Amino acid sequence: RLEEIHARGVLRVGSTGDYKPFSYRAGANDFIGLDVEQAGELARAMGVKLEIVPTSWPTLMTDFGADKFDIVLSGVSVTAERQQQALFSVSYLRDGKTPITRCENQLRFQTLEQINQPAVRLIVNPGGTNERFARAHAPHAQLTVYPDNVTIFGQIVSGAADLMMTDAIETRLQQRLHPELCAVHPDAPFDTAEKAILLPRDAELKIYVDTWLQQRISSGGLQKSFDRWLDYPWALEPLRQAIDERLLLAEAVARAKWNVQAPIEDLPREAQVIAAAVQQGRTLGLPDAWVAAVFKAQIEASKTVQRELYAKWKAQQAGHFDDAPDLANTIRPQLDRITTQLLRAMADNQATLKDTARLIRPLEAAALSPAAAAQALAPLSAHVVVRFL
Amino acid sequence: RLEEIHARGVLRVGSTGDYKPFSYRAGANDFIGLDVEQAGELARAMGVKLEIVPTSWPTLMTDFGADKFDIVLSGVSVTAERQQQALFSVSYLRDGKTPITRCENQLRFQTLEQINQPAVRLIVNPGGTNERFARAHAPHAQLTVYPDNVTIFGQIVSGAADLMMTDAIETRLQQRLHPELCAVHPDAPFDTAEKAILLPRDAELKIYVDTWLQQRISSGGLQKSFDRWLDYPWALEPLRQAIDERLLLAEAVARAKWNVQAPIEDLPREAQVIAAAVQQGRTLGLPDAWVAAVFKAQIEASKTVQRELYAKWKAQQAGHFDDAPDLANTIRPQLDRITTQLLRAMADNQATLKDTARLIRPLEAAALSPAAAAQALAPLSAHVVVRFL
Amino acid sequence: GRLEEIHARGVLRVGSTGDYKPFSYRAGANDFIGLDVEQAGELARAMGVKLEIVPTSWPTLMTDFGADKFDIVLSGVSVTAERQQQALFSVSYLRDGKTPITRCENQLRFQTLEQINQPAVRLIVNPGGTNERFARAHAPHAQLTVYPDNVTIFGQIVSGAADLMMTDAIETRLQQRLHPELCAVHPDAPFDTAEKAILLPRDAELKIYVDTWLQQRISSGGLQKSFDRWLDYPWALEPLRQAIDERLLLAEAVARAKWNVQAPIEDLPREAQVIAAAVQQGRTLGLPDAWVAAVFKAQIEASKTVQRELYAKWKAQQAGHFDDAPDLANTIRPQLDRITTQLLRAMADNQATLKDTIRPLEAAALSPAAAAQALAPLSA
Amino acid sequence: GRLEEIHARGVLRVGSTGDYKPFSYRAGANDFIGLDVEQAGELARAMGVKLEIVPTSWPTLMTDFGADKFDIVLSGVSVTAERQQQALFSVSYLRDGKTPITRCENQLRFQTLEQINQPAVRLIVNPGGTNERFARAHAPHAQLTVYPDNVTIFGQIVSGAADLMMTDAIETRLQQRLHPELCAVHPDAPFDTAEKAILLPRDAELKIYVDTWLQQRISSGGLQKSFDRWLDYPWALEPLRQAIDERLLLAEAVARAKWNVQAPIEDLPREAQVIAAAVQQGRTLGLPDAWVAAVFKAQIEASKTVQRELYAKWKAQQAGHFDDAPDLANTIRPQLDRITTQLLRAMADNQATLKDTIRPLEAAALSPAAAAQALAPLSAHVVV
Ligand SMILES: [Cl-]
Ligand SMILES: [Cl-]
Ligand SMILES: [Cl-]
Ligand SMILES: [Cl-]
Ligand SMILES: [Cl-]
Ligand SMILES: [Cl-]
Ligand code: NA
Ligand code: NA
Ligand code: NA
Ligand code: NA
């Protein structure tokens, strides 16, 4: 197998994309997380390209049998069912299952006895170890099997189920994401399992991966990676998406203004944007001085992109952009939607935004203008956020 | 002393008003809580009126020495400094100090050793046992002293301090109020203290109070009171304040409209109120159908008050109300402020509003119109809140 | 159960340290006395069962609890959080806490925890305790010897071997009476507060039972009464009683030895010497002679009653020679003279206490008549 | 410390149950052997300190840990969450878990947990264990006897007293060799998974030390090697050795008794009868007589060497009469005949195993020469 990879020139890696902090699909061709980073390092070490292949827990082993990928790096628990068809690496992590529920009912679900009874509405994603564990250790409970995820933890928030039981590390993270949810004794889970790399029945590969892993572990490199991706501000990932998406749109804004040969400064639009942001921010209890600064920065950043393009296009004496979207009817609506998103992210994650060596990953739109990207983030640096509050 | 009370005809009771669930000043002449209810029962038993006298922890004993009140019922810990000047009753409760912090950092602050070091930002209210305990058992930490005890737990939510150490029962409550906060091992506090009634140096009174208390305890009456005031929806208390204050203003609205003999229906104002509420609600992620229903009800309730008054005043041939405030300039502004408050309370406490035998205390404005009061609350009954979500 | 498990087993097992007058004192044997032993009694009666005191100590307190060696603990136990981890408590029957005890000269040297907490000062505590925890927390700079017997620990202060101890203010009220040289430091204004309550296991129905019982006792004045009794109780007399007891138990050996040589029981020379020597020694302790003579006459007559009963028994059995019987002149009579000393010193301390004024001696097992004889001149 | 406290104290204290071949077996005495005893050894050497095995058991495992009876535990301990509460673990040196073992006829009767979990079936486990927890969780309906000795528990299945046991697949691979009548049930496909690792105390510097040590051992093939050694190790011979040992230690009593009557050491009648009776009994067990005779000749000659050494010692001391010396005819010789039985049965089981292939007997304390004599005809070459 190891030769087939070297020949094909590419490591195909299964990843569910549903399991923060291991493997998350933020969109696009944009997977992030611990096990995505590791897949990266392994590819580099073999001297080949990486390809993430999407999978899911229900489809995991059938996708393996169809040879859709070479390995799976996705916070996979070593289990015996899986050992039937597959090899595993040495473990890189030790975890296992603990409950997550609304913060009121933490005491209602301390024990498997408390949990295993017909009163209780249990929820799991399908295919999983999470499904197997719920069927084995809580049969009497009422089990809905809910075939989506990231939004499965919504079902508990909204009272539609009572609790879920999942890996204690998933639970530590989801309690940060949903403040209304709480992890149940995650330092003392109900059981133990290894996390390791799913491999095919090929011993030379297993030896390769294991040697690789043991090196990474002993040298501190995995420990480092674990620190990064747990202290990673998963909560700020929407905030980042909003700032990012808004800036990338400045390209379209420029195209449209260019066609009408509008000037870049549009003082009416600036006043409205800021005035409307402040109003919306007051309803969310944000202070106005700060909201204004934030949005001033967003505008100034946009305008830097615009100015760079206008310069370029004046030099070209460029003409008319044919599939440029409408400013009033398409674009400006999108921008106003994002303003909302951005303000809400500011409102929720005021604490998370004061931590300092817990820091966001870099914007896509530094590709477009690194200067503009800096401008946009400037008033969300911890020091100014503390300055305001 | 017991005779001086009977003579004066009034029991003067210290209460800090800062310590849910014992003693809270919701405004006004409006104290509520366990120890306010108890002060009530003691007054009744002596056959006298109750007067709450405001105090605070910093002023507690000086206010006692100035004979500003007879006793103090306010979740007061028995301590030796206080025993110097004062008697105590028998205990009605046994507690003591445990940390509260963001749900992430539960594990960071399990122990006093973990807590007592210069990295950590500790916060306490002044005057207290809480201040004395933090100075004695955690000197190396950074201690900000933040002189308002109701909004102090905001400072932790918002990352401005790391944790607070306070009575484990206060911590049980504040974790319910702020879902993002979590109590640290409140079943296993760092220490123990009695809660009891602060009394003056007079033995006949002490015997009276103690006999009273022992009766209340043995008969189940205190146990009952404890159940009530812990299951009391403290979270919904602002929501209730907003609905209440808004309805009480309908009295002013009627006075003003009466002077101009305006009609009660104003369909423009109705459309604007609802339209503006829905908009604001969208920014808070409330669903619009529900916000509209809620506010329809608030309007219909206002109009019921108006109609009752108009009828009354036609019968009286009442004249002109001289100090009636301006509708456009004074009143309608206030109403719009309260709309904001009300929406935010809806946004936060969607879960709390689905619990059913945890129910709010009755509105002040049932004095004005019980029918209107019913109308206003109707679309915040659990069944309709669940119907919408 | 738990309340049912007790009713079934037919016995209430109660922890008691036996080291903490006036709550719980082990005078020997199966012979516990004090406030909390009396209370354990009343609770047993109320449940309609027998009482069994189970010995414990402060260092072993909670491990003994976890091994289910007893049902409850009644022993002047402070409510503390460590103990609340494993256990329930009753309602408090007392509110107290820690205050210093020191020699009466140095009362003013140790008014405050600042005065106390410094490296000059020699502090002493019994181990296991709240007393140990409090000394470590509130006086770390002082020099701390940990002295593992709580009854004779107050001797160490008297004798200058430590400067002070810090303990429950009620313990301090008592020990200042027992050692006239020691004085309680502001016991009406202790350094802190604690509840005393009954340690219970994690069973709510029992807690409700005990609490209802206790609240009754408190509200009716019955606990207040019990407190008055057991503080005004003449604790001073307990060594005197131990000495009379030990001396009488030796009459068994005396008889064995005399039997082997078939000596007669009455020995008028020995009687005169014993009394004469007691009186002399008593004069040095300022005891009046008439009284010492009476006391020791009684002790002699009591011894002889034991002897006579045994001689009768042994004549009937035709018992032979007792092989491991100690020598009279060389082993036994020395021991008797040692105890005479102890007995006289106990008399000398408690001359006042013996105007005010009892359960049986251990040696009522041997001869109840002799035991009566021995106590007779400590009436009145 | 902790690593410093060990270096200071000069000794590594290691828990071992002594009940779990091939990891940890207590043959007696201060005589532990196995994979994890060998490893404990290597770790001690690496720290530059002496080893002390501290006995423990599964029921007492964690309480003994909390009482600080030892530093670490190396005993084929599964990583479990209960244990993680009080304790750290090393990296795993093995991945295993539970599979059935039963008589070779009933292999097909117990393929699945469904087949196993029902009231017809007589299940057996040792207590304290993961083995007990797993049987209670995954097979409640079965009849569960809890049999508190883990070495002879597999006898109960052989003898039909229970139907099967469920235990670590590696334990099952070994016990099927030891009892030919028993068979492992799909040990390449267990019902579940667990790590084996070293139980450590809450001290991170030590954990780093042990882990670095272990990762080296693993990556270099040294643990794989050690696994091969201790599975191919002739465990069958350990009872045989116990019987030779016990029999020789009795020669001390034999001498005491003969000394009191000043009997001579050589007794050619007794020799002929011992050998004659052993051969007869051996024929019923299908042992060949020539070999049994050799073995027992050696046992006799070895006994006599002990006797001679003691007689010499006692003549020099002019020792007198031994007062609590047992009777020869009535107490001792019976015991010797009981052990002969044991010894022959151990020979009968391990005829194959005695084509392969030792440490000292306990009775080298008594006479090293005699101990050599006793073992001499169980060198391969004499099994001609
Ligand atoms: Cl998994
Ligand atoms: Cl207080
Ligand atoms: Cl405490
Ligand atoms: Cl205590
Ligand atoms: Cl006295
Ligand atoms: Cl195990
Ligand atoms: Na010290
Ligand atoms: Na005194
Ligand atoms: Na053995
Ligand atoms: Na069963």
Side-chain angles (χ1 to χ4, degrees), chain D residues 124-142:
Chain D
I124 197 172
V125 296
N126 63 304
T130 67
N131 273 351
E132 203 205 72
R133 201 265 264 281
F134 177 93
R136 283 191 196 279
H138 293 64
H141 301 325

Side-chain angles (χ1 to χ4, degrees), chain D residues 22 58 90 108 161 208 228 286 348:
Chain D
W58 297 118
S90 74
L108 278 299
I208 289 155
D228 304 325

